[PDB]
Amino acid sequence: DVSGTVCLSALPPEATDTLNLIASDGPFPYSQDGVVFQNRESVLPTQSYGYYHEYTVITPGARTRGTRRIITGEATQEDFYTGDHYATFSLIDQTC
């Protein structure tokens, strides 16, 4: 399930950076940005394979990709944030 909706301005600033890169189709900093997210655990709504894609939200100071991600869905404005490596998600509201 999705935990609720959160305004973009209430998320870390790096989530705004990642969304700007998604809108321009990159370039992205990590080679894993843009791969399909399988939703194997069925936390997000069930969809066809390839409906969801994953992008890194950089964690300042981290040596690795860390635990923050944006998952896009194919629908308009359908973007989810996770800060715990896919355990929980919130829908991003870009209007606030």
Curated annotation (Swiss-Prot):
Pfam families: Ribonuclease. It is found in: Secreted. GO terms for cellular component: extracellular region. Changing N39 to A/D/S: Decreases protein stability. Its EC number is 4.6.1.24. InterPro entries: N1-like, Ribonuclease/ribotoxin. Gene3D superfamilies: Microbial ribonucleases. It catalyses: [RNA] containing guanosine + H2O = an [RNA fragment]-3'-guanosine-3'-phosphate + a 5'-hydroxy-ribonucleotide-3'-[RNA fragment]. This is Guanyl-specific ribonuclease Sa. It comes from Kitasatospora aureofaciens. Transmembrane segments: none annotated. The active site is at E54 (proton acceptor), H85 (proton donor). Belongs to the ribonuclease N1/T1 family. One of its GO terms (molecular function) is ribonuclease T1 activity. The gene is rnaSA. Disulfide bonds join C7-C96. Keywords: Disulfide bond, Endonuclease, Hydrolase, Lyase, Nuclease, Secreted.
